[PDB]
């Protein structure tokens, strides 16, 4: 998605948290 969940919170509809950053595991956005 192009974000960062340094706090550990990125549970969005269609996106996952990837501390420090945020997005996915394959792409990372």
């Amino acid at each position: 998605c192009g974000e960062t969940c340094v706090g550990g919170t990125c549970n969005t509809p269609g996106c996952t948290c990837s501390w420090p950053v945020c997005g996915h595991f394959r792409w990372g956005v």
Side-chain angles (χ1 to χ4, degrees), residues 2-19:
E3 282 77 20
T4 165
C5 53
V6 186
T9 170
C10 228
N11 276 281
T12 25
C15 227
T16 47
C17 182
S18 192
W19 188 101

